[PDB]
A paper describes a structure:
The voltage-gated calcium channel CaV1.2 is essential for cardiac and vessel smooth muscle contractility and brain function. The structure of the CaV1.2 channel complex is composed of a pore-forming α1 subunit and auxiliary subunits α2δ1 and β2b. Each domain contains six transmembrane helices (S1−S6) and forms the channel in a domain-swapped fashion.
In this study, we determine the near-atomic resolution cryo-EM structure of apo CaV1.2 and analyzed the distribution pattern as well as potential impacts on the gating of a collection of pathogenic mutations in CaV1.2. Although all S4 helices in the four VSDs are in an ‘up’ conformation, the intracellular gate remains closed, suggesting that the structure of CaV1.2 was captured in an inactivated state. In addition, the α2δ1 subunit was clearly resolved and sits on the extracellular side of CaV1.2, interacting with the E149, D150, and D151 residues from the DI repeat. The β2b subunit is composed of a GK domain and an SH3 domain and is associated with the cytosolic AID region of CaV1.2. With the local conformational shifts on the S6 helices in CaV1.2, the intracellular gate is formed by L401, S405, L749, V753, V1182, I1186, F1519, and I1523. In our CaV1.2 structure, both G402 and G406 are located on the S6DI helix and close to the intracellular gate. In the current CaV1.2 structure, R511 and R518 are located at a cytosolic amphiphilic helix N-terminal to S1DII (denoted as S0DII).
Residue numbers in the entry:
A (entry chain A): 1400 to 1484, 1494 to 1574, 1582 to 1593, 1607 to 1638, 1647 to 1655
B (entry chain A): 119 to 177
C (entry chain A): 354 to 447, 509 to 778, 889 to 943, 964 to 1078
D (entry chain A): 1137 to 1254
E (entry chain C): 222 to 276, 297 to 314, 317 to 407
The structure:
Amino acid sequence: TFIKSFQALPYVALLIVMLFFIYAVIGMQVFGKIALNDTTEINRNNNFQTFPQAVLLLFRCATGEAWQDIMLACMPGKKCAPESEPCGSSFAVFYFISFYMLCAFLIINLFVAVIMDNFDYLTRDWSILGPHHLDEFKRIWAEYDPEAKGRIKHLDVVTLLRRIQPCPHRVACKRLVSNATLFALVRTALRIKTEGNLEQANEELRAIIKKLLDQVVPP
Amino acid sequence: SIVEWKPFEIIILLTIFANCVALAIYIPFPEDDSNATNSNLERVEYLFLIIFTVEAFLK
Amino acid sequence: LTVFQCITMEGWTDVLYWVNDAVGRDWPWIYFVTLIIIGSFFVLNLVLGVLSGEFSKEREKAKARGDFQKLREKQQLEEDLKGYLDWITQAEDIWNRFCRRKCRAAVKSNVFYWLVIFLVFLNTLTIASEHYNQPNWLTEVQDTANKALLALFTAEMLLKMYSLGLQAYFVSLFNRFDCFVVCGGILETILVETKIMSPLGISVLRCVRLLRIFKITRYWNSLSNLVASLLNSVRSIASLLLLLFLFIIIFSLLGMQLFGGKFNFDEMQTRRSTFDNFPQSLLTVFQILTGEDWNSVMYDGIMAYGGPSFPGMLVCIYFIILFICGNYILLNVFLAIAVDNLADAESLTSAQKEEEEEKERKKLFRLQCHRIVNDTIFTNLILFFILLSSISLAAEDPVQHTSFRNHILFYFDIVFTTIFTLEIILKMTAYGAFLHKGSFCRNYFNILDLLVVSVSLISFGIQSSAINVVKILRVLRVLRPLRAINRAKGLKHVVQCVFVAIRTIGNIVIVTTLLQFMFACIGVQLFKGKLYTC
Amino acid sequence: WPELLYRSIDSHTEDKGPIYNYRVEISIFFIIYIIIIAFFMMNIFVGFVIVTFQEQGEQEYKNCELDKNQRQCVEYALKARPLRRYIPKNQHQYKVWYVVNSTYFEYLMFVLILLNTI
Amino acid sequence: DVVPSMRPVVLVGPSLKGYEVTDMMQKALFDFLKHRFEGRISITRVTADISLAKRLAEVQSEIERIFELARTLVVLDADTINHPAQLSKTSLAPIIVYVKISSPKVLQRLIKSRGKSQAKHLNVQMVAADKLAQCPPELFDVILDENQLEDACEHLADYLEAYW
Ligand SMILES: CCCCCCCCCCCCCCCC
Ligand SMILES: CCCCCCCCCCCCCCCC
Ligand SMILES: CCCCCCCCCCCCCCCC
Ligand SMILES: [Ca+2]
Ligand SMILES: [Ca+2]
């Protein structure tokens, strides 16, 4: 379910990628020519020289990994690289602080968007019946019946895999008497209303709720 | 048993708090060194042992 | 142990660089980047989800516990005391005391309220004006401004004290807090005059002045509801914090008995985060909980208990358990407090404010043969050109001045400038051009297309100058990718929803910024230049 | 953080170098700042965003209609579709199918993979 | 029956008029009545009983003198009406106001501030507030729900525009 939610919200991810791209480019041009050297944060392993390296450094800053020292490395007064024919700006402080806030905000936004999208399942008491119950019912019926081979055909009670969670007081027999099987179980497993007219009441519901074949729903 | 009706559990919890205090003062010197305080905290620990074991026996 | 060290994201990049120095830089980043993303971000997202969603369950149970319903009872209760005590305030006055009506009248007036807000602004400007080596005159200016603001603030404080009923005055929380801060200011004056002030005194009293700076943010309600819920839940807040404090004490008293004074190594004693004495064991445990240099402390413990071996180096159990329970127990306490209370607090803004709104309601050029055709395929075509334009400058060589590839990218830039000016020429045909009721000025995103194109064009205009002006133009030309926003039908929805989220966050973000400013002022007072080290 | 904390703890007087553990009480300032701002207020940010997104998602609250469980169920009312089983017809195929599809085989294969990882 | 050319105005407060608080709920209130109804309104001050009216000796002329002021083309203030029943015994087509405290928990706080002498006498005061929480709308005409005066005061004027 979490992976499926990620599929349904791709534009937030594209927005985060856009942030990374814009900031990697900006860091590429301003802090590009900083002189590489060990004993300093801007080194052979972190630098705004190649786009992959810039993205890696920005990702490092995103994970809150000594980004303050990177910032102090790019502050002005730094010697410029030999390729230049000094370098280092005072724009670094704003650059890194703004990046940290914005990247943290969009990461929070993606997280909470996925939480919103999966809220239904993430907030599910697991007491009321759920689609997992329908799936296991489908599987047991499939064992009882291969592909699309069930219309009524019912003369047995082998479908007792239904545990305490929807013959106690023979209510199972009454429910069997009263896709049709799935619909009947749904309307009666919840025990929505008991006035001898739920079929009529529901017959006036599926008309407004719906579309597809309704010549089997009433039963 | 009727002593438990008398609320000494208050004094027992104050004793637990006293022992909690008596562990922050215990300085763990590197290699067997020990100032004066560490040499009285053993006695305080003996007292705490006695009171706790009496409470265990009673309960 | 090392993979787990990467999942917590602390000391992550060190192992990545150590590996890169062994097996080249090309591939290895894949392993650790996937490790971080998958492990850290998915597990963090899932734990947040299964707590927030779970927290909704206990919130639903709480609503049956009258926790919110009882909270509203204490809000209207205290609220009506002032309104009814206003009558006695307006009735006690039907020796001559006719000036009471006039003084009370100014109290509610906007002139006096904005005057006191301005005085608070002066108060914050004076303290915020701190500086490492203040000009000698600025010290006297700050001291006299403090004296002046103190005199006034107490004058209007007493005015409100006598203009309004003293009991009614003390009923309000904000007025009691204002009395507290003015009393702190009186203490400031007495202590400074008598020269018996102490560093704790200056600290906490600068703090009380900064509290008086809370007189700002009074009209707004979103922070007010949070404050009310926090005050209601204090007796519930103290339990969780007491439990966490007990846990930190236990995992510090255990570290004392394990690593007590065993951090003595022949290497230079930079082991500041040690377990020697209880007051510092607490700081080390706190550091581990937040997880700043968790690696360093774990390694020091491992080395203390022998080297890497089986009998030793089992200490990793202690650090791992500490870190896990901490960043789980902290997560529960703080999210619980910031969700259950805030969710309740946010509901006041929807419960009492909503009904009260109802109560008031209850109380009551050429235009012919143009060619807009082809704007359908050109949608995806312009998307593709924007994408490839964005990719263009990314591959640029930043470090080589006489670049073998910058001229190639210049050719791409020329081609793409032509392509992206074609639609600028086209847009004149469509309604707009800052005319025709300004259909062009009604969509700033359309205008933003020109701005990026303009800067791209402007870069060439001054390019021949060979002058430093064009240096910033190249930096700003990076706005090309955003053009896809105006040309995308879902990205617009995403960005607008994000802006809406920002507008919602405004209140909390401003409260956090103000409290951070408070702590910055206190820090300036404490460490105004006492950090230098030869 | 800890570098700043242990450089501030060693703060003696204005315009003077540090002194080892001069005032360790200063940690109260950093402890309080840490808890309040970082923990409390950033967690308030996360909780506030969660609450706002929950409110936005329930814009179509539709309190008149009944539970959303029936919403999901009736949207699934198009279920009871064919499921691929293909019980083998050849008896030689059937023996291997039965032995393969028995839970014992799955448990055994899990043990095999577990031992492979070991 | 027959209007006395006017609809006399009375206010019973939230509880007994016998103490200071109840009167102060209306002492300033009456001030604004004449200060926004110049000539349109008049006020009267009495201390006798009006319930005993056949449409004690002082009561005989009390009803007349009120009717004497009602014929001038009026607000009454007394200590007899603690419930519309005290006025329901006569048909003078009056208008009666009620001060309401939706939460009796407020009563103690109001009482707790004025004085400790009547602080223990809250039971005497509060029962009337209970007594002032039973009559259906018909005997509950004028409504005083909001707290402060200005919002409450505007809701007094609107009911005074029924005829004038
Ligand atoms: C709960 C209040 C009392 C807490 C302290 C109880 C133990 C104190 C005894 C040890 C103190 C050091 C004395 C050693 C002799 C110099
Ligand atoms: C929580 C993970 C570690 C817990 C178990 C301890 C691991 C000990 C085995 C590794 C060391 C073996 C000997 C190394 C000789 C250089
Ligand atoms: C419970 C959260 C962690 C709190 C850490 C700070 C505890 C207090 C440390 C200072 C105690 C006094 C030091 C010695 C006297 C100046
Ligand atoms: Ca971190
Ligand atoms: Ca770190």
